Write a protein that binds this ligand. Structure first.
Ligand code: CA
Ligand code: CA
Ligand code: CA
Ligand code: CA
Ligand code: CA
Ligand code: CA
Ligand code: CA
Ligand code: CA
Ligand code: CA
Ligand code: CL
Ligand code: CL
Ligand code: CL
Ligand code: CL
Length: 1040
């Protein structure tokens, strides 16, 4: 404390920089690093400008106008300082080196970097790059410095980097710089400010920049970036936690535990055998020195750092996964890249037998927050790269990632034992016009940094192992559009496309494969069981293709391709040359060295201007040629449909079905019906049936109704937002997907046992409280106010400014029917004139909602509407004008009610009529009066009195009160005393009717309570009748 706690931290930090006071120099990995450190230092020492008159310290870092020279100079000084303090270095303790380092620092303090200096040009080098490197130098050289020197150097850093104010990675770097200077300058307040700076980076987010609960990381607002920015956040945070850990300024924020979760959720799934998946690395795929295997290193390092501070369970889990990856790293990618400290940590870990390798990871995971998906199975990994109206196609800024045009066009990455597939200059040689999985216009580009006008991107999953994803492609700046779906099971991936349409006048292509080959480029390509030529230059349009086998450059990397129904597949085996400069021509990364790599490219040609093109193929990784053939003969998958309406695949071994629904209309495929865009997956067993549902559009604020065409006995389990509607004879449920963020909702039904009870019918949830209705669209934000006179004690105050302003709600109409639509409006001196529409159809005329009279509220009848199917409906209220006495165009909406109408409840029974009439005795029909109802009527022929009867049994829709009418054929030969029974709820009534009068009209007999069903009857008897008895029709009319 005041010296020694700082001393302790400083020593801990220095040991991170140089590996510690002592270590095993017989460890060849350590030895190689020590040498590398020594050589580098000698390099910059040799090139250093050393004389009093100097104007810079190195020529490659001139001063005055480019602030990069600040960082460059201090990094050079750091390298020298490193060798100076590195145990085992032939330059360790070198006095001349020491003197040159220190003179360099004092020169910088006198000329370039000091408290009060001019911060010309680029801010970053003054506030972050420089201080960061200066901090490190001072850490190493501390004991060799005076207090006055340390004071000066720190005063400069406090000057350029005074407080934390920025966001994302800048904020992190602010925090590191501030924390480390604090430690070096023995300034507790400054260290605490450093510690506090990272808190704002810790919470999860649901939109915009940061980490998402689903594992996504987004940066630059719209880009999948776990491998880019998120990677550097993880690094700095894991380091700050490690340094501060145990100290007075240790990280206490409970959110710090999110950083440990990030590993399980945001990193582990994206590291395949030492390769950080390129689809989450954004623009960084264009950095030659930072290919996927190199990109993985910082994450592995961060995980090791996190294990040193993690709780027991996590530390164990972390060490196990890192060990796994290190054991795979036969060419020492990691060991040759990191500091001695990490070499020590890494080696200790692989030599520790109490830590066992984690092994192969097996899981499926949907990253809905960044339009990504990962399938990890035994033998392969599969990455899926999409974009939507939420996520940009790819990022290209500062002349980086220049050829990334199609990297988000539904691109597929297949990972296997060929660890180098996407490194070893994959990106600088591959034909970027034909990236795997994508559907594109041939040899074209696409505007960068753009989102599509399509929201359908995402998917759902089951058992945490099987998944289905989809993307409605619409190339930006092009007409090209397509529906692409992926179905990922135990050992196959099915890819389907349809609705492929373009008017761009260019041949349209879908890329099945574009694989990098061995150095010969001779990997055997076997097609329909027949070997093709293995020589470079090979090119064919292969028709009637059933299956293909491409042999892997390394055991475990064969790939099979099955083409359901056969396909015309174009093929090309060629050598390709290019340099990284094409992808990245920024100052830092420009590299023009040419490279030549070999590729096998397989694709579909949909031709020019397709109107409704399609494709289907099945990836069969890690299978022999004969196994591939074997699969083709008896496929374990069945494509149920592949159209623009839906795309569905069932794996018949697993009995897992995946379905993508493309339209917001009722749609049926397989056993499943959906009334909304949805991604759905089912798992069936002997004892149960499970369904997974998601809204990939992420913009449904209402419900999704699902039917499953199979009988269930009851419920086993369900997520919250599921509402079971029926078990038998068919499964019925709905999902409330408002604010879903594209996540998945699951329900599991029982198929055996004794049937339980079906759920009771779900009546219309009247009233629909405005204050609690999900809003689907609006022009002006409404506010809820409290009011004891309002339904639910709350009303919704519209703030509508002008004509055509609207608010559109989503209501769950749980029972199909024709309903009269009413709304309860609270009195307000500011009440406009509104027009209701439902689903784009106006209902009724516009209603002037203003009034001056006494009452606090009124019930407006907007009008009638027919809801043919149960589900969500959009009720829109549009400002159309205003009463002259109104303040403006606002409104105080309390609720909606849907009331039934005669259309639903009124019942008519004619004498014929095939159902509802049962006669007794012989009745005679005729057409002779036109006293109405139907063609004919019947009569008893004035004979067989007290023997005959006609019983009208109506089907009462809803229990309630019903007016009972009757019509008949009147004349003069009719009976005047026709006895009529009305059997209703509660008993039976009897009256006589005079049928020689009031014919042709509906005659009110009475008004009674009836139960829903057929327990009520209206009988006409003939007992004691003084004339002809006519039977025609009855009509029940509900009241009110
Ligand atoms: Ca700052
Ligand atoms: Ca490696
Ligand atoms: Ca299978
Ligand atoms: Ca065919
Ligand atoms: Ca979202
Ligand atoms: Ca407005
Ligand atoms: Ca209300
Ligand atoms: Ca009739
Ligand atoms: Ca009788
Ligand atoms: Cl010199
Ligand atoms: Cl130089
Ligand atoms: Cl940033
Ligand atoms: Cl409220």
């Amino acid at each position: 404390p005041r010296a020694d706690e700082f001393d302790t931290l400083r020593e801990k930090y220095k040991a991170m920089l140089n590996g510690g006071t002592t270590y095993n120099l017989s460890d060849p990995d350590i030895a190689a690093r020590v040498n590398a450190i020594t050589v580098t230092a000698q390099g910059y020492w040799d090139s250093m400008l050393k004389d009093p008159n100097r104007n810079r310290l190195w020529n490659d870092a001139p001063f005055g106008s480019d602030s990069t020279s600040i960082t460059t100079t201090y990094r050079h000084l750091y390298d020298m300082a490193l060798a100076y303090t590195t145990y085992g270095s032939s330059l360790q303790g070198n006095a001349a080196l020491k003197a040159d380092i220190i003179s360099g620092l004092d020169w910088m303090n006198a000329n370039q970097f000091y408290n009060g200096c001019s911060q010309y040009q680029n801010w970053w080098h003054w506030q972050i790059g420089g201080p960061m490197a200066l901090n490190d130098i001072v850490a190493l050289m501390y004991t060799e410095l005076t207090a006055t020197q340390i004071s000066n150097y720190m005063a400069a850093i406090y000057y350029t980097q005074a407080s934390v104010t920025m966001t994302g990675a800048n904020r992190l770097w602010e925090s590191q710089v501030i924390a480390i200077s604090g430690i070096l300058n023995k300034d507790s307040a400054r260290v605490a400010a450093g510690r506090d700076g990272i808190s704002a980076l810790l919470p999860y987010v649901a939109k915009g920049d940061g980490f998402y609960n689903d594992g996504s990381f987004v940066q630059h607002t719209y880009y999948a970036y776990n491998g880019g920015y998120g990677s550097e956040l993880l690094s700095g945070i894991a380091d700050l936690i490690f340094i501060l850990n145990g100290s007075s300024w240790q990280v206490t924020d409970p959110n710090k535990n999110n950083v440990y979760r990030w590993i399980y959720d945001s990193y582990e799934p994206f590291i395949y055998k030492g390769n950080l998946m390129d689809m989450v690395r954004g623009r960084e795929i264009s950095r030659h020195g930072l290919q996927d295997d190199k990109a993985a290193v910082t994450v592995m390092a961060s995980i090791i750092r996190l294990s040193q501070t993690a709780a027991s369970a996590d530390a164990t889990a972390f060490k196990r996964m890192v060990k796994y990856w290190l054991l795979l790293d036969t060419d020492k990618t990691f060991l040759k890249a990191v500091s001695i400290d990490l070499i020590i940590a890494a080696n200790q870990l692989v030599n520790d037998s109490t830590v066992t390798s984690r092994g192969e990871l097996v899981k499926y995971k949907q990253f809905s927050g960044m339009d990504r998906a990962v399938q990890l199975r035994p033998g392969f990994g599969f990455g899926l790269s999409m974009f939507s109206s939420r996520i940009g196609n790819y990022e290209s800024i500062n002349a980086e990632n220049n050829k990334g045009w199609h990297t988000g066009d539904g691109m597929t990455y297949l990972y296997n034992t060929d660890l180098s597939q996407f490194n070893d200059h994959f990106w600088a040689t591959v034909d970027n016009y034909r990236l795997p999985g994508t559907t594109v216009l041939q040899n074209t580009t696409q505007t960068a940094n753009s989102r599509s006008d399509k929201s359908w991107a995402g998917g759902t999953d089951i058992l945490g192992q099987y998944g289905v994803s989809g993307m409605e492609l619409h190339t930006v700046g092009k007409s090209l559009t397509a529906k692409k779906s992926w179905f990922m099971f135990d050992d196959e991936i099915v890819a389907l496309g349809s609705g492929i349409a373009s008017t761009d006048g260019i041949a349209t292509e879908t890329i099945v494969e574009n694989r990098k080959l061995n150095s010969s480029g001779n990997n055997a390509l076997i097609v329909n069981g027949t070997a093709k030529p293995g020589s470079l230059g090979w090119s064919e349009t292969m028709t009637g293709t059933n299956y293909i086998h491409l042999a892997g450059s390394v055991p475990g990397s064969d790939i099979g391709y099955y083409f359901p129904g056969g396909a015309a597949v174009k093929g090309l085996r060629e050598a390709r040359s290019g340099s990284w400069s094409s992808l990245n021509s920024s100052a830092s990364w420009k590299d023009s060295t040419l490279h030549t790599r070999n590729f096998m490219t397989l694709w579909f040609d949909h031709g020019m201007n397709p109107t409704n093109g399609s494709y289907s193929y099945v990836l069969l990784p890690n299978k022999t040629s004969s196994a591939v053939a074997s699969y083709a003969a008896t496929p374990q998958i069945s494509i149920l449909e592949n159209s623009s309406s839906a795309q569905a695949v069932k794996e018949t071994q697993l009995n897992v079905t995946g379905i993508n629904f493309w339209n917001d209309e009722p749609t049926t495929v397989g056993l499943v019906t959906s009334n909304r865009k949805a991604s759905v997956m089912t798992k069936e067993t002997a004892s149960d049936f499970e369904i997974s549902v998601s809204d990939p559009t992420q913009s449904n604020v209402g419900t999704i109704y699902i039917d499953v065409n199979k009988s269930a006995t009851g419920l086993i389990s369900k997520d919250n937002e599921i509402t079971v509607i029926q078990y038998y004879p068919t499964m019925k449920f709905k999902v409330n997907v408002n604010n879903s963020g594209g996540k998945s909702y699951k329900v599991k039904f029982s198929l055996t046992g004794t049937p339980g009870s079906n759920p009771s019918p779900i009546p219309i949830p009247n009233p629909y409280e405005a204050e609690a209705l999900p809003i689907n669209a609006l022009t002006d934000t409404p506010v809820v106010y409290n009011d004891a006179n309002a339904s639910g004690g709350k009303k919704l105050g519209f703030n509508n400014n002008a004509v055509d302003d609207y608010v559109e709600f989503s209501l769950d109409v749980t029972q199909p029917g024709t309903y009269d639509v009413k709304s309860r409006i609270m009195k307000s001196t500011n009440s406009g004139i509104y027009q209701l529409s439902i689903n784009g159809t106006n209902v009724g005329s516009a209603q002037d909602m203003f009034w001056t009279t006494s009452e606090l509220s009124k019930e407006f009848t907007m009008g009638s509407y027919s809801f043919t199917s149960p589900g969500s409906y959009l009720f829109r209220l549009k400002t159309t004008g205003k009463n002259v006495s109104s303040s403006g165009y606002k409104l105080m909406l309390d609720n909606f009610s849907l009331v039934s109408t005669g259309i639903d409840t009124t019942v008519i029974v004619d004498n014929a009529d095939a159902a509802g009439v049962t006669k007794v005795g012989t009745w005679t029909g005729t057409n002779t009066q036109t006293d109405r109802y139907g063609a004919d009527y019947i009569h008893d022929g004035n004979t067989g009195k007290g023997t005959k009867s006609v019983t009208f049994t109506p089907n009462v829709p809803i229990s309630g009160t019903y007016q009972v009418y009757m019509m008949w054929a009147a004349h003069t030969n009719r009976a005047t005393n026709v006895p009529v029974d009305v059997t209703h709820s509660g008993g039976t009534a009897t009256l006589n009717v005079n049928q020689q009068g009031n014919g042709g009209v509906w005659n009110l007999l009475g008004t009674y309570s009836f139960n829903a069903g057929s327990t009520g009857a209206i009988k006409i008897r003939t007992d004691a009748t003084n004339g002809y008895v006519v039977a025609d029709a009855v009509k029940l009319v509900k009241v009110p």
